[PDB]
Amino acid sequence: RSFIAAVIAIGGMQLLATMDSTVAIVALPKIQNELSLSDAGRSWVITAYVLTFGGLMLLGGRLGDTIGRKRTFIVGVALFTISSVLCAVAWDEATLVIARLSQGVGSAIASPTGLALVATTFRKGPARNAATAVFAAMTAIGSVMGLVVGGALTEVSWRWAFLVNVPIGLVMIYLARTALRETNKERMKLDATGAILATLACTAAVFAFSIGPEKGWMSGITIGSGLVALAAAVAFVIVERTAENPVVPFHLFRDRNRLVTFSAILLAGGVMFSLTVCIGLYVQDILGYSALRAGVGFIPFVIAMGIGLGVSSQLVSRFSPRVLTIGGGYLLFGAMLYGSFFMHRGVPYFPNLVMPIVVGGIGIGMAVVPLTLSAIAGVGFDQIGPVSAIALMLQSLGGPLVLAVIQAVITSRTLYLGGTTGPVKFMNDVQLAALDHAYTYGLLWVAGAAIIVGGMALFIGYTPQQVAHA
Amino acid sequence: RSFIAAVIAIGGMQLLATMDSTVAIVALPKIQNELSLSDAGRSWVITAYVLTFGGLMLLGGRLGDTIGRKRTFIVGVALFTISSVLCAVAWDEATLVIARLSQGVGSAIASPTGLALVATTFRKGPARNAATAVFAAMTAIGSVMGLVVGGALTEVSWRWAFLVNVPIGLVMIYLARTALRETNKERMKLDATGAILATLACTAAVFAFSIGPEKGWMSGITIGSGLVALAAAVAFVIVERTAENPVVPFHLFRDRNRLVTFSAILLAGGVMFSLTVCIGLYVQDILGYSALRAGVGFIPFVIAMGIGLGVSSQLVSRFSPRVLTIGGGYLLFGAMLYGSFFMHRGVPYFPNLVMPIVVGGIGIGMAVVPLTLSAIAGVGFDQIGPVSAIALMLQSLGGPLVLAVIQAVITSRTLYLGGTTGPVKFMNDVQLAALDHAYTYGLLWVAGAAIIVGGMALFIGYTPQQVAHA
Numbered sequence A, B: 001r002s003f004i005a006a007v008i009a010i011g012g013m014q015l016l017a018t019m020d021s022t023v024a025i026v027a028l029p030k031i032q033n034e035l036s037l038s039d040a041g042r043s044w045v046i047t048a049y050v051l052t053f054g055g056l057m058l059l060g061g062r063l064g065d066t067i068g069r070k071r072t073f074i075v076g077v078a079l080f081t082i083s084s085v086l087c088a089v090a091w092d093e094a095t096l097v098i099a100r101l102s103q104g105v106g107s108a109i110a111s112p113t114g115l116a117l118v119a120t121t122f123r124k125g126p127a128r129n130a131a132t133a134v135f136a137a138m139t140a141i142g143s144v145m146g147l148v149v150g151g152a153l154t155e156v157s158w159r160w161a162f163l164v165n166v167p168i169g170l171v172m173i174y175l176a177r178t179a180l181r182e183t184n185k186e187r188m189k190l191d192a193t194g195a196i197l198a199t200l201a202c203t204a205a206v207f208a209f210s211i212g213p214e215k216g217w218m219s220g221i222t223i224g225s226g227l228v229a230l231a232a233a234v235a236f237v238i239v240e241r242t243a244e245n246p247v248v249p250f251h252l253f254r255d256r257n258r259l260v261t262f263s264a265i266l267l268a269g270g271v272m273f274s275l276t277v278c279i280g281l282y283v284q285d286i287l288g289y290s291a292l293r294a295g296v297g298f299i300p301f302v303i304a305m306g307i308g309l310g311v312s313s314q315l316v317s318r319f320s321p322r323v324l325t326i327g328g329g330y331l332l333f334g335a336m337l338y339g340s341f342f343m344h345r346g347v348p349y350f351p352n353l354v355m356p357i358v359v360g361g362i363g364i365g366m367a368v369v370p371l372t373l374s375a376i377a378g379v380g381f382d383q384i385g386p387v388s389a390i391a392l393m394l395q396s397l398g399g400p401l402v403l404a405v406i407q408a409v410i411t412s413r414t415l416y417l418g419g420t421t422g423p424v425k426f427m428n429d430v431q432l433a434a435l436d437h438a439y440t441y442g443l444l445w446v447a448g449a450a451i452i453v454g455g456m457a458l459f460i461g462y463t464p465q466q467v468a469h470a
């Protein structure tokens, strides 16, 4: 009961953060009809959460060293929970944007602390391997459950969708309070100048990329804000040389296999993210499943995901992370090839759509556990904070970049086969077929990106003694 | 009875040529101890067969049009059978070289004609699908049976190994005489200037490539002969513009998928050849099975490959050659990866060495049949000759090129890990472990080359209606 309560509590913010984003996307069309925030306001509710979430993420890495990881985890979750109630009673667009900003601040604090608590709470060995599986397990549970909740009670009101976080957030605070322990160690003074410039450098960049498409890539505020991001980054690196308790220990990233590992998670996160966004759109638009049915149809992915995670936790103590990552992805690679050839519109569910999802889930489950363990290997307690924060930022940063490339490819080929850009409800059924074939073509591009992750994963070179088996 | 006799006869030259090369390699050390031909003559017996086999191969493609494909097939096999007898009674090195030169001429005349007999003898449909499987099936039978025969009857005398072809060559000539019919079509005038220049260019290129390492890549005769190869190649292309019944119809290779299909077989042949050469050396050297035991241990490969060929012949009428080539090699890609991680010295036979061979054999069998049917698709009867000759030449040319790259990578990592260049019998057992891991490393490079074949195979685009299903 004690070990079970601890692993569930540590992975709580992965459940909440992934579930909230999926619900917010689902309920966007109605928030127009009620608030009338217009097409401009459509993207501010999304970008507001991402503006502070990425900006303050590297500040939240070092906030557990100077104050405490258990306190930091609880405070971040509590602020996230409170902000969800305020977002559910937003009067107009203005109230909603402040609400989404505060959720990003709370998530920026608790997300890095959750992955740091995995390394510092469970000693290397079977304990850390079981905890790693649960931490990655609940990220998929929240994603699928966000569809089901986002598709089930959407029909009544979008305000009840943001209140579902409140019961869940309260349970994670209670579990973390009575299951986690405060470490009795002296605090480290926070790096003021290093922490400030990192927030300014990151926040300005996120703002510039988000507003760029709205005003154009050469509007003047797009590259004008990029100038501030560049100037802040240059000043951050210079002061970082003579920094005490540094925010980003550049020296810890050398020519060894830490860069290879951290290069994989950035590009792997892009493949995982773009595969999730494209598949959801295809099932909703082409196959006409709807939000509720799509969420219930992805339940087998979670069960398949769990089987891969559970098997990998046992095998990680006998096989190096190199073979397990390759072995798991080989199953995933076959699943995407099958879908790229035999996934037209109107196919049945059980034979065609279930098996590739089940096979792909086991492959992903096998590869995530070795990669997470090697990302937190050979670090310690005085540098686990920033290293865990860097891991989550690269995973999230690689999402939008790879997906941006993929979506451009899908759009281009839809016009090539003969099609239109715009809402799917006004297509001629000859223009809908072109969109279908475009999505499967873009799945080959995702396969090419996955292959590059594999060759870069051949250079890891960690033994099962270092990542696990201690 | 008439059908089985016809398919066996057409593939007879594939069994003989593949069997002869394997037997010739096995018996080279003993030919040294008897004839005392020195190391220089050791390689001349091999190059003599290839010098005329590759030099005259393109000539034989158009020889069946002006003489007849049945008469051309009997003449080539007959000359091959006679020369094997002359090779078995060679008293000095001169007699052996002229004997090996004659065998290449016989193989050059019959090898292109055998593949052209597949397209002309059997109508497009299930009959041609079954004939193609048998044609590919007994190319593999000769290789494994060459090990068994060469490794068995070479503790008595190496001369007897060359007489084993005589019974087989006689049987194929009888079957071809009583099972094939001579087409009644008017003969075509041979392209005199085009044929002589094509022969001179191909022989000179082989000569310079073979003699280069002996005399050095800049000896004076190496690049001296390469000068003649370039001059003959240029003149061949110019005169082919105004050539009637061209030896190489360049216009038949446009931007369509004929180039993609013919580029796949070039590099696919290289992957197959280097995979066969390296696996044989590893089994004999690292594992120490010997030639006889190695041949008996590769019997499951032929059985496994027969299943792949038999299954693929049925499926080729419903699925395009694109998916079958990708589907078959996906099994082969996994087999190479498993052998690249769990294949050290001292492992048993049935658990570790049998299964990857069986899985790889089925994958190879699945992809061979679709590639062969698309290489002889949509040509006719007045150009099937030269097109079949080009298909075999690219397959044979790709072997040495890819294997040269692989063997260079093997040698470099042997020295890097700590190793010695020389015979394997003078090794320290610490120098022998380095050679073990060099071979396992090179298997990753063969898998990387296979991936390139796959992406290049995604551009084929043939439908099952064209290659088969008639």
Ligand SMILES: CCCCCCCCCCCCCCCCCC(=O)OC[C@H](COP(=O)(O)OC[C@H](O)CO)OC(=O)CCCCCCCCCCCCCCC
Pocket (backbone or CB within 6 Å): A022, A025, A115, A135, A136, A139, A140, A141, A143, A144, A146, A147, A265, A268, A269, A272, A275, A276, A277, A278, A279, A280, A281, A282, A298, A301, A332, A335, A336, A339, A340, A343, A356, A357, A360, A361, A368, A371, A372, A375, A391, A392, A395, A439, A440, A442, A443
């Ligand atoms: C990385 C290491 C970490 C180290 C660094 C430390 C970080 C630790 C974190 C670990 C957690 C990672 C994995 C978590 C998984 C999350 C994804 C998820 O659980 O979500 C499921 C998704 C639903 O997405 P949603 O719909 O909710 O959101 C989209 C909106 O709807 C649209 O805006 O779908 C799926 O089940 C994906 C199935 C993939 C299987 C293989 C593909 C087979 C091909 C079939 C043909 C398809 C047609 C072609 C189409 C092209």
Ligand SMILES: CCCCCCCCCCCCCCCCCC(=O)OC[C@H](COP(=O)(O)OC[C@H](O)CO)OC(=O)CCCCCCCCCCCCCCC
Pocket (backbone or CB within 6 Å): B022, B025, B135, B136, B139, B140, B141, B143, B144, B146, B147, B265, B268, B269, B272, B275, B276, B277, B278, B279, B280, B281, B282, B298, B301, B332, B335, B336, B339, B340, B343, B356, B357, B360, B361, B368, B371, B372, B375, B391, B392, B395, B439, B440, B442, B443
């Ligand atoms: C292409 C389309 C055509 C269109 C154009 C028209 C042309 C039509 C032709 C069709 C015929 C093609 C295929 C025929 C197959 C021939 C090969 C064969 O039948 O021969 C078997 C070979 C024995 O070779 P030999 O010994 O005789 O000769 C070597 C000397 O001994 C050395 O000098 O072995 C094998 O069974 C290969 C097994 C591969 C399985 C996959 C790999 C698994 C990895 C396991 C770990 C291994 C250790 C690592 C090691 C690195």
Ligand SMILES: CC(C)CCC[C@@H](C)[C@H]1CC[C@H]2[C@@H]3CC=C4C[C@@H](OC(=O)CCC(=O)O)CC[C@]4(C)[C@H]3CC[C@]12C
Pocket (backbone or CB within 6 Å): A401, A402, A405, A441, A444, A445, A446, A447, A448, A449, B455, B458, B459
């Ligand atoms: C459907 C028919 C016409 C088959 C033709 C397929 C080609 C049009 C596609 C198939 C796979 C594609 C490749 C798949 C993956 C990549 C990886 C891609 O690399 C990245 O994904 C980097 C993106 C990033 O890192 O941000 C560059 C293009 C390339 C080679 C693509 C080039 C074009 C290819 C060969």
Ligand SMILES: CC(C)CCC[C@@H](C)[C@H]1CC[C@H]2[C@@H]3CC=C4C[C@@H](OC(=O)CCC(=O)O)CC[C@]4(C)[C@H]3CC[C@]12C
Pocket (backbone or CB within 6 Å): A455, A458, A459, B401, B402, B405, B444, B445, B446, B447, B448, B449
């Ligand atoms: C202990 C460390 C050094 C091992 C890490 C593995 C890498 C050193 C190897 C693994 C496979 C290799 C790749 C395997 C295959 C190829 C194909 C090769 O493509 C070919 O053109 C070869 C075949 C041909 O010549 O036709 C180019 C290099 C590359 C990408 C190799 C580059 C180096 C890689 C990634």
